[PDB]
Amino acid sequence: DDNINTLWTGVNPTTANCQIMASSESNDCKLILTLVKTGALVTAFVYVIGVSNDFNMLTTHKNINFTAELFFDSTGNLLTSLSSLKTPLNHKSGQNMATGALTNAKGFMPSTTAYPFNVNSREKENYIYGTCYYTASDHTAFPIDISVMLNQRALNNETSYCIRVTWSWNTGVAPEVQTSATTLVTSPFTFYYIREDD
Amino acid sequence: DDNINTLWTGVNPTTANCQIMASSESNDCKLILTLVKTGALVTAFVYVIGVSNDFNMLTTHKNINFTAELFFDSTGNLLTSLSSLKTPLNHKSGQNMATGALTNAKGFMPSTTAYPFNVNSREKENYIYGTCYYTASDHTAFPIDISVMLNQRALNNETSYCIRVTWSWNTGVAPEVQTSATTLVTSPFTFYYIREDD
Amino acid sequence: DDNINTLWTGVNPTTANCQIMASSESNDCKLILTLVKTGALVTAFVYVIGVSNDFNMLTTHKNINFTAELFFDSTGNLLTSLSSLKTPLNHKSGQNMATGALTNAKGFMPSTTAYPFNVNSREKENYIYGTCYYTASDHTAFPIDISVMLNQRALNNETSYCIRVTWSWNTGVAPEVQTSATTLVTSPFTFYYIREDD
Amino acid sequence: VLDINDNEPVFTQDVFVGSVEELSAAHTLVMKINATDADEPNTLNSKISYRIVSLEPAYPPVFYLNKDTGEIYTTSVTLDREEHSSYTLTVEARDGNGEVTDKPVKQAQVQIRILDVNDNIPVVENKVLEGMVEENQVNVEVTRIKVFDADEIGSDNWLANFTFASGNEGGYFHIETDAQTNEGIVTLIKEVDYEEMKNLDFSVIVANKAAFHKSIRSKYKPTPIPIKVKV
Amino acid sequence: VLDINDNEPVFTQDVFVGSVEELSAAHTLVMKINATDADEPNTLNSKISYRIVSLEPAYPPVFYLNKDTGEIYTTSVTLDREEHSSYTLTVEARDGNGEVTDKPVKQAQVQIRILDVNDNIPVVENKVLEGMVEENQVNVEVTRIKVFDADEIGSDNWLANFTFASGNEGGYFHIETDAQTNEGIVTLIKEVDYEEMKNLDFSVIVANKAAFHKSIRSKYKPTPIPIKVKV
């Protein structure tokens, strides 16, 4: 089965499943994530879609920095109370999340051998960088710097794997104005990491 | 079979299979495209090879903008009369296109749920950006901006999926001169999208 | 088996397996490489970890240019005496290299049809470019330009496939000073190529 | 009366005018060259084979004429208005089935103006800038910023919109832009005692009055211009 | 006669000269240091253990000497000619099986010049530029553009090639380049009535006479220099 090789948020969820900003009292954006087992790597495919007006208002400022925390247990299941994404990942059922349990969720995780916790001599291996874009309302692409950070922190003894994705820009002008700000949609971003054993 | 996971133009076709420029009366370049089903994503792998002298003459100018249209029917088969690529895609048979029909060609398409047609509130999700390069005759890499555009247009009721790839540069000097212009070969470009169901 | 789809150096080898600089009398760095068969492509995943003090001293200069040569025989097995990496690749066994022989190693190679040897009319197809980063000791990312070069040279009649990866930067300041230089770790880099038949 | 090559394809008008915009993509329609047949339709004389004779700025093969319909397009060579503001295209439509001989046939004239887009960032020419104020000074235009935009002098792609990056918190100054020269005329609205021996240091961000285009937005990184005003 | 350590490895010549090019990749051959044995070959004295003693510009470990063959290479630390134009390498080849004692052995001298490549873009030093013309004025050199390239003064990587971005459509001016100072000497070929009160505004793109290198081509974005000539 090629459905169990993918762990992902759904395609266009009917409601917002992520709470990026702590100022938001509920979920304020749609987070689209996709993890695909590529041999010994994971092809990780992530972008966000803004939902709440405060979240979509971000395009009107010039210095934006928002991050998504994904904390995972010892089995690979998402810790929803601590993570930015408040809806657990699942396998592939068409364009939708599956409904059952997770079959070898631990294989999707960033490996601790490649990415250790709290090893200062091996600090630099946990960092992944890249760039996505934001298409403006006049079809202008604004590059957004992405920093991906693997297995840095355990907030408790429960957290075993950590993925931090941080979008940020420092542009010259704001991408939009208050009247033209419609939705914050980032272009998709793809990165890889060495995955943990099954 | 791992051959049916790939939909692609052949490797180095014996003749030009694409007509990028409308000024050309026949096919003027070789278009190399490869679509690989990666779980719920498609790893799309595209670049062009110039054939005609007018097409290869493009490297001598500073403001170049050429695009490839790929229109696909409801089943995923290429509409050759409307598309830039005039030879339909097929599965993998060594370094060559297969000869039979297409087995689940619809699974390779950019999904309409992720990429809808004519939804202005969801306009920004159809855009994918990136960069390829052109190695000059003195082994200088000139970055070429690529914009990929998914499911924008149906030229008739027949077209169900659309992929537009646009290469463009605005450099300071031309990459070549008239004597040194040999061939327009772009470095390969890889992008992903959420694929349509089978 | 999904283990045989990956050809790779191990994760964090216990000793240095690569001799990048010719001035080094022994292996001076850890080279991490991963080749994954992605349909008709290979997802190639490479970065280096500095080991020797002379190698880690490179971060204190502003103009750095080091390269890794990978030469492969007619069957795909690494020629260790000629290559930078002195330990042959193998399949996946957890976080470690496998111990047996290689099952269809030739399928991982850069294809000669797409990437020919000594064809001047088709010179530009052998070049692949990109960018990785070096996280500084103060968590500053310094972009490193990468040039990947496929099937250029046969040093003898034995070499059938060649992969050259070259890291290089020309920064304004050195990333580190002599006291702050700890380890040269590059961020991972991912590129694709059309693979040779099995 | 047969459809022999006995007459000419009658044009609509001799000096055609049309327009297309700077930095347009390939295969963008510029005009449809209107012409008619003085013989019967659906004949060889109805086959009006339009034919470009001379680009007068001939060097780049920018425009493409569709010989079947007369539609004029733009090729993959992208227009840059700041090197060729206008194109003259001596076209010459020919009847018959395409016989290219020295039988003289009607020549039209096609004049194409290219419409400028704001694909250039204004640049501050001077690098040291300084002003002087005394007691009870108001409505003083002490310094003018010289900017240089390349987008069609007189247009909103060319006028400079100035804004204060920092330093004008009390509302001391207010910048007006001259349109005859595109100058950075500052003014003075608040009076400062020169015996206070203070400073009125500030900086300006310069941009065009119209918004920038596709390719230079997201690359526009404005560095402030440190104008120093000694008191 | 045995192969005891009784003599010295005879060199070819004392002050060696060679050359290597700027921005070369790692492990590029610079020379092969020629030396011979005064004892029998295939012995311990035939083991000519070449040994660098002193880089005189010692700070970057740029060159690598192969102690078996005497071949001198370039390390992963890339040469930049504009900070060290030449290197002096006091080498000292030693016979025997590598015994490093205070027995004095022959010292050679290796002088290495680095060959400049055009890895620097010329920059226009002045920022406001202006010229003046009157009636019947021709062959006037009214303004000179000061440029500044860093690539080996006197070379074609350093001379400036000027070209007109815009404004010189009638063929008014023609720029010649001085080689003694690398100046932008313009000239005047067309006569303009000053009582016409017109303008001769134009702009210049500056570049080196030789083509740019690998790393600064595709990053060379020339902004025109708005030279204003009042009539």
Residue numbers in the entry:
A (entry chain A), B (entry chain C), C (entry chain B): 128 to 325
D (entry chain D), E (entry chain F): 100 to 330
Task: Give verbatim lines from the article.
In 2011, desmoglein-2 (DSG2), a component of desmosomes carrying four extracellular domains (EC1 to EC4) has been reported to be the main receptor of HAdV of serotype 3, 7, 11, and 14. The critical entry step in the viral cycle is mediated by the adenovirus trimeric fiber and more especially by its distal globular domain called the ‘knob’. In the present study, we investigate the binding mechanism of the ARD causing agent HAdV7 to the EC23 module of DSG2 using biochemical and biophysical methods.
HAd7K-(EC23)2 and HAd7K-(EC23)3 were solved to 3.5 and 3.1 Å resolution, respectively, which allowed the fitting and refinement of two atomic models using the existing X-ray structures of HAd7K and EC23. The overall root mean square deviation (RMSD) between HAd7K-(EC23)2 and HAd7K-(EC23)3 (without the third EC23 module) is 0.5 Å. Each EC23 module interacts with two different monomers of the HAd7K. Furthermore, each EC domain (i.e., EC2 or EC3) interacts with one HAd7K monomer.
